[PDB]
Structures are given as structure tokens and as C-alpha cells.
Amino acid sequence: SEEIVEEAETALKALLEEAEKGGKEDALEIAEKLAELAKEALEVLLEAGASPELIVRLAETALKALLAIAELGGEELALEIARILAELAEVALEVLLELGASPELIVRLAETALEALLAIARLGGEELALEIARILAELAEVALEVLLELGASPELIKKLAETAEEALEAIAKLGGEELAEEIAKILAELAEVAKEVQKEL
């Protein structure tokens, strides 16, 4: 279990190095290969009954590596890895659900993935930040549903929902009018999901 994390983390760092050495042309193939390796390692830890902290460490290790590639990479590469980063985080949140992880580890992993998306949008242009906001919103709604299936706590749902609230608000200050208008719709959909999760608890 813990040896699976150590070998997986070695590969994630090994791929990250070859992403930095190579140009941005190969950085996307390495980013996709880094997430597929991390996702496959999460399933091995899933069927092995690993502690949820190992799942979070492995997930965050791959989330940081993906973020590092997006930061080094251009504007087009930023949005691509963001999709990869959220897809990998949604897989990880569902493994933590299957294991019945503590709700605090769910928020921890979700905050980590949401902060990385916020960093990618900040480094990106205006049309960049709109798609990140949709990605960020859909990830936060997934994490709210995971907390709903785990009992959670009214303060944890409020904490995660407001973390996504402040993240989306920071994107509104990032771009012009058409972005600030779409953030309001995005904020409404998010607040609607947190409305139902707080209702059923």
C-alpha cells in the first residue's frame, strides 16, 4: 500500500522532470501520461484498502505536478492540463468516497484541486478564465455531492462551498464584463447545489 505510493510518486516526479526538460510540445503527452499513471495507481490503492491519507498524498502529488507543467507551459497548455487536473481530482474524490474517507480529507483534496485551478486561471488570459471557472464549478459541485454521501458536517460543506465561492469571485476580478456576467450564473449554479446539500443534512 505505502510502497505503491512510493513507486507511483517516483514515476510522477520522473515524468515531471522530462516535461520540464522537453519543450511544451511533449509536455502535454507527459501530462496525460502522468495523470493516467496516477489514476491507475489510485485504483490499485482502492482495491488494496489503503488509508485515505495515502490516496490524498498520491492525488495531491499528481495535482501539483500537473500544475507545475501548466505553469511552465503556455496559455493553451494551461487550459488543457486544467481539464486533466479536474478529471484526475474527480476520480480521486470518488475513490475517497468508496473508502469512506473522513470528510476533512475530501475538503482537503478539493481545496487543493480548486486552488490549482485558481492559479492556472490567474496565469491565463480572459477567455482562459471563463473555462476554468466552469471547470472549477463542476469540480466543486462534485465534491459537494461526495460530502453529501459521507454525512459530512454543515461547516465542512459551508467551508468547501465558500472556498469555491471566493475562488470564482477571484476569477471575476480577473476579466472584463462578459466574464463577470458569466461568473454570476456560475455562482448561482454552485450556490444552488450547496443549497440542496445543506438541505439534506
Author numbering: 1 to 201
Which of the paper's sentences describe this entry?
Here we describe extendable linear, curved and angled protein building blocks, as well as inter-block interactions, that conform to specified geometric standards; assemblies designed using these blocks inherit their extendability and regular interaction surfaces, enabling them to be expanded or contracted by varying the number of modules, and reinforced with secondary struts. We construct twistless helix repeat (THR) protein blocks from identical straight α-helices (typically 2–4 helices in each unit); the length of the blocks can be varied simply by varying the number of repeat units. Restricting helical geometry to ideal straight helices with zero helical twist in principle considerably limits what types of structure could be built, but this is more than compensated by the great simplification of downstream material design, as illustrated below. Using X-ray crystallography and electron microscopy, we validate nanomaterial designs ranging from simple polygonal and circular oligomers that can be concentrically nested, up to large polyhedral nanocages and unbounded straight ‘train track’ assemblies with reconfigurable sizes and geometries that can be readily blueprinted.
